[PDB]
Amino acid sequence: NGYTYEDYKNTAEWLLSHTKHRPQVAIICGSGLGGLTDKLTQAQIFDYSEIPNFPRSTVPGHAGRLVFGFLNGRACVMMQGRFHMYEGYPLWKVTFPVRVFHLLGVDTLVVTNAAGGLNPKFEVGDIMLIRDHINLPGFSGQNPLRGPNDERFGDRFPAMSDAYDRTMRQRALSTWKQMGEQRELQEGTYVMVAGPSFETVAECRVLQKLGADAVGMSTVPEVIVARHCGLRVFGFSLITNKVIMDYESLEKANHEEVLAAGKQAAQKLEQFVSILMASIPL
Amino acid sequence: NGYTYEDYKNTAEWLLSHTKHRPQVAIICGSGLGGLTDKLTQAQIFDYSEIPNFPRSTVPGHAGRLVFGFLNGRACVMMQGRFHMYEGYPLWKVTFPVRVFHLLGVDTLVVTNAAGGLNPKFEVGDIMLIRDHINLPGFSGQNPLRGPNDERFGDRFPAMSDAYDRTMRQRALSTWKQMGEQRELQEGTYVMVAGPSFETVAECRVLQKLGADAVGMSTVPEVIVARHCGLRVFGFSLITNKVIMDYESLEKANHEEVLAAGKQAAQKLEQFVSILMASIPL
Amino acid sequence: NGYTYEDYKNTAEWLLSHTKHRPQVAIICGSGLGGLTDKLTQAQIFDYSEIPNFPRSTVPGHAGRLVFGFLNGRACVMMQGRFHMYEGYPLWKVTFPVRVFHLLGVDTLVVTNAAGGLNPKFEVGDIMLIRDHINLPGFSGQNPLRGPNDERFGDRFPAMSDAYDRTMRQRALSTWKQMGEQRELQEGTYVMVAGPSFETVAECRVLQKLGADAVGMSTVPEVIVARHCGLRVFGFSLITNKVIMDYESLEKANHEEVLAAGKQAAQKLEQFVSILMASIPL
Numbered sequence: 001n002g003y004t005y006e007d008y009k010n011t012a013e014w015l016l017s018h019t020k021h022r023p024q025v026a027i028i029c030g031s032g033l034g035g036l037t038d039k040l041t042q043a044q045i046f047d048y049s050e051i052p053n054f055p056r057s058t059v060p061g062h063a064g065r066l067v068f069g070f071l072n073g074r075a076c077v078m079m080q081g082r083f084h085m086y087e088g089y090p091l092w093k094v095t096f097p098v099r100v101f102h103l104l105g106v107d108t109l110v111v112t113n114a115a116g117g118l119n120p121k122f123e124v125g126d127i128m129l130i131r132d133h134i135n136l137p138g139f140s141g142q143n144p145l146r147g148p149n150d151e152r153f154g155d156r157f158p159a160m161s162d163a164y165d166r167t168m169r170q171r172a173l174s175t176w177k178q179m180g181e182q183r184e185l186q187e188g189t190y191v192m193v194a195g196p197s198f199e200t201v202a203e204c205r206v207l208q209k210l211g212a213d214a215v216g217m218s219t220v221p222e223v224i225v226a227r228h229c230g231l232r233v234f235g236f237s238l239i240t241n242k243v244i245m246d247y248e249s250l251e252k253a254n255h256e257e258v259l260a261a262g263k264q265a266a267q268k269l270e271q272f273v274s275i276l277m278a279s280i281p282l
Numbered sequence: 283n284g285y286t287y288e289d290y291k292n293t294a295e296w297l298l299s300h301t302k303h304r305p306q307v308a309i310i311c312g313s314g315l316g317g318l319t320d321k322l323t324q325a326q327i328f329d330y331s332e333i334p335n336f337p338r339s340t341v342p343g344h345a346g347r348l349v350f351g352f353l354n355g356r357a358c359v360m361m362q363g364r365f366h367m368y369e370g371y372p373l374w375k376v377t378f379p380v381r382v383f384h385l386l387g388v389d390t391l392v393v394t395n396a397a398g399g400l401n402p403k404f405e406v407g408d409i410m411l412i413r414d415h416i417n418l419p420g421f422s423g424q425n426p427l428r429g430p431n432d433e434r435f436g437d438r439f440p441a442m443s444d445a446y447d448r449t450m451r452q453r454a455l456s457t458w459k460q461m462g463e464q465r466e467l468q469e470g471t472y473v474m475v476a477g478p479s480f481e482t483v484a485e486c487r488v489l490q491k492l493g494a495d496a497v498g499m500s501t502v503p504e505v506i507v508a509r510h511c512g513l514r515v516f517g518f519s520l521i522t523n524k525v526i527m528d529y530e531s532l533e534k535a536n537h538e539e540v541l542a543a544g545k546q547a548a549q550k551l552e553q554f555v556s557i558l559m560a561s562i563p564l
Numbered sequence: 565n566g567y568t569y570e571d572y573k574n575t576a577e578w579l580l581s582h583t584k585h586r587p588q589v590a591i592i593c594g595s596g597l598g599g600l601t602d603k604l605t606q607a608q609i610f611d612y613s614e615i616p617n618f619p620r621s622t623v624p625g626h627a628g629r630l631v632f633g634f635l636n637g638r639a640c641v642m643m644q645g646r647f648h649m650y651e652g653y654p655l656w657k658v659t660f661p662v663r664v665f666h667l668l669g670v671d672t673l674v675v676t677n678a679a680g681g682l683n684p685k686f687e688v689g690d691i692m693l694i695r696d697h698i699n700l701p702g703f704s705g706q707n708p709l710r711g712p713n714d715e716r717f718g719d720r721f722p723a724m725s726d727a728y729d730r731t732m733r734q735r736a737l738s739t740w741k742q743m744g745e746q747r748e749l750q751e752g753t754y755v756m757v758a759g760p761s762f763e764t765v766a767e768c769r770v771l772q773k774l775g776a777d778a779v780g781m782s783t784v785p786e787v788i789v790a791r792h793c794g795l796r797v798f799g800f801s802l803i804t805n806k807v808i809m810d811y812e813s814l815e816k817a818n819h820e821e822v823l824a825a826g827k828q829a830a831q832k833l834e835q836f837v838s839i840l841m842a843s844i845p846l
């Protein structure tokens with residue numbers, strides 16, 4: 001890890017003194033879910049590039065910013081654009097924001113992402129609540145906590161079986177009932193793979209066999225660091241596509257489709273997250 | 283990745299100006315399959331050591347060369363000796379040749395390798411056509427595309443479900459029928475593991491459960507980079523041994539046997555590849 | 565690998581000339597199993613910090629020492645405190661001791677560790693004999709042998725199917741019978757995961773499906789290097805806890821419990837190892 005405790009502190013103190021905003025809930029917007037930033041009131045923007053020690057974006061779209069403000073009663077801080085392992089960032093960089101959020105006073109982390117559907121019941125447009133995750137990179141050594149542990153953040157061996165807040169998931173099923181939607185709020189296990197290339201058929205079959213319902217290349221690391229911090233964690237995935245499971249199919253997974261699905265099912269998530277804010281304690 | 287686009291370009295331009303040969307098909311010879319180089323006509327050799335930016339071989343046999351020429355009508359370029367992750371090379375080095383081939387004008391990549399049999403039907407000597415692969419290293423982060431993506435080569439999120447050319451596999455089943463062989467042309471999923479040590483029984487059982495038919499420690503990376511390039515991909519494995527699946531057995535997997543199997547079933551592959559060249563378009 | 569053959573040699577020669585002790589059996593004490601060092605007679609201690617080229621401990625407890633001496637007839641060398649991948653050490657550092665032991669004249673390696681139970685029959689306190697292992701980090705590239713192979717230590721492609729000495733496991737079942745214990749000596753497959761965070765429910769389910777009986781974040785690397793050396797290998801795990809397999813449970817895996825289980829079932833292992841020494845040849 002190239003960051004010392006002081007680096008986290010310095011980044012927090014800098015932000016704290018550059019905004020009157022004191023966020024309680026940190027929200028990490030997934031792919032095509034950055035619209036959430038529009039609903040924040042008294043929205044103050046910060047380009048990642050101007051924040052000390054922040055991993056400087058590469059060239060996806062060169063748009064990486066932190067937006068503080070209020071979302072339906074809650075003082076938030078939103079990450080529009082997240083860092084992925086496939087871009088070359090080590091996990092201690094990818095999850096650097098999470099630790100900053102913690103020293104800023106945040107106690108809740110909401111993570112969202114786009115994902116391929118492994119569970120055959122899922123349909124494009126669906127919203128899967130994350131009850132658990134399978135951290136494939138972590139089994140091999142790619143765990144954001146690798147390296148010496150700093151007592152100030154958490155313990156050497158944090159548990160993850162209770163990573164996704166039971167309460168918040170129940171309250172989300174409610175908020176969705178109040179939404180009065182045709183499709184029900186899906187729920188399942190999110191498996192993380194590094195990517196960036198998409199899975200082959202044999203691979204989708206493996207991920208299915210392992211018991212995963214959705215697959216993506218992010219989130220798990222932020223969640224582990226969050227939990228290591230003491231943060232309350234709640235999150236969901238937007239099934240942007242059904243991963244190919246047979247060799248007869250003549251369709252391929254593509255960034256085009258994923259962005260399109262994020263485009264249409266857009267505002268639906270935005271409502272759900274905004275309304276969900278009320279369900280979050282303080 | 284320690285290579286810039288220019289490095290690939292410089293290596294291509296260098297080769298291009300050191301040979302009148304303009305290959306269309308790149309062939310990566312697996313272990314004990316390097317004999318294929320003998321059939322090339324007007325064969326021009328290049329030691330890896332003399333090619334700019336090429337990963338310099340270590341000490342397997344210190345023999346690593348690029349052979350240009352013609353193989354049954356097709357202008358080829360053969361890699362006799364390939365780079366493996368277990369030797370310490372990062373994947374961006376292992377797959378460096380593939381990108382060079384592309385800038386040289388190659389549009390087809392034929393990859394061959396030796397492998398352990400996971401599918402109990404397979405027998406030593408068998409030839410498994412690769413219909414799909416399971417990229418275990420990739421799930422964890424060891425994917426040759428990790429790091430910033432260069433638009434000039436391909437897209438950020440290339441698909442792999444269609445990685446192994448459907449057409450070429452069918453035409454291979456034909457060419458094998460014309461071969462009039464006792465044993466049929468096997469076909470299945472190749473699982474890549476880093477090695478270098480051989481699998482334990484519990485591990486073979488895992489690889490079996492995942493649905494893999496053959497296991498090796500190469501290929502998948504070259505295939506991913508190839509596909510990322512736009513290359514047509516076709517390849518096969520020579521089952522050099524049946525991986526141990528029970529604890530009663532008193533036999534161990536060894537490099538001795540693998541080389542021996544490659545030695546006898548040698549020329550059989552050489553015919554198949556040479557004849558297969560005619561099946562490859564232009 | 566940052567170590568040259570000479571570094572191993574220099575460390576061996578240094579130890580050899582700083583102790584009259586010439587160990588035959590190397591013992592790696594797992595978590596809360598370091599008590600084994602108490603039974604050594606004519607016990608000579610060496611802090612890792614004073615041994616040339618030894619990975620210098622971080623801050624777990626700052627206690628990392630090598631203890632030479634005799635354990636029930638056998639000239640031993642015990643590692644009290646082992647190096648783990650999750651601390652940031654690359655595997656060539658983690659397993660550095662093993663190669664030193666070999667050049668010191670050791671021909672047997674006994675490895676012990678604490679582990680979570682995956683097999684539902686296992687109970688806290690149980691002692692699982694290791695018949696085989698699943699090396700998840702290794703499939704991805706995290707194998708201690710990665711990098712050039714030094715002929716002087718072993719071969720490029722060592723086998724692991726016969727890694728855990730058949731004979732010694734049988735003799736251990738005997739020694740346990742002579743122990744006259746209520747519970748029988750368990751036996752099974754140890755799966756290694758990098759950690760440091762504990763598994764989630766979905767993950768435990770995966771490890772179960774793969775056929776693992778116990779899970780930990782060590783051992784496999786030392787075993788692979790040992791086997792690569794020619795060392796006889798025998799080892800066991802102390803089931804310090806039953807990993808959570810259902811979402812209804814309200815208990816979490818914690819370092820507290822693991823240490824406690826190691827605390828009570830302590831001396832039981834110490835007897836077993838001490839008595840087992842007699843079963844080890846020479």
Ligand SMILES: O=c1[nH]cnc2c(C[N@@H+]3C[C@H](CO)[C@@H](O)C3)c[nH]c12
Nearest residue numbers: 114115116215216217243253255258
């Ligand atoms: O089929 C899939 N496999 C793996 N990840 C995704 C995702 C998630 N994100 C979306 C994004 C690519 O379009 C990349 O960062 C991965 C959507 N569909 C799939």
Ligand SMILES: O=c1[nH]cnc2c(C[N@@H+]3C[C@H](CO)[C@@H](O)C3)c[nH]c12
Nearest residue numbers: 396397398497498499525535537540
């Ligand atoms: O049983 C096996 N397990 C994993 N790989 C192989 C291979 C493939 N190559 C062959 C070569 C070792 O002999 C090394 O580079 C791996 C053949 N048999 C097996």
Ligand SMILES: O=c1[nH]cnc2c(C[N@@H+]3C[C@H](CO)[C@@H](O)C3)c[nH]c12
Nearest residue numbers: 678679680779780781807817819822
């Ligand atoms: O449930 C478990 N999962 C993974 N490893 C362990 C272990 C083994 N060691 C014990 C130690 C943590 O308490 C750390 O180095 C891992 C005990 N229980 C479990």
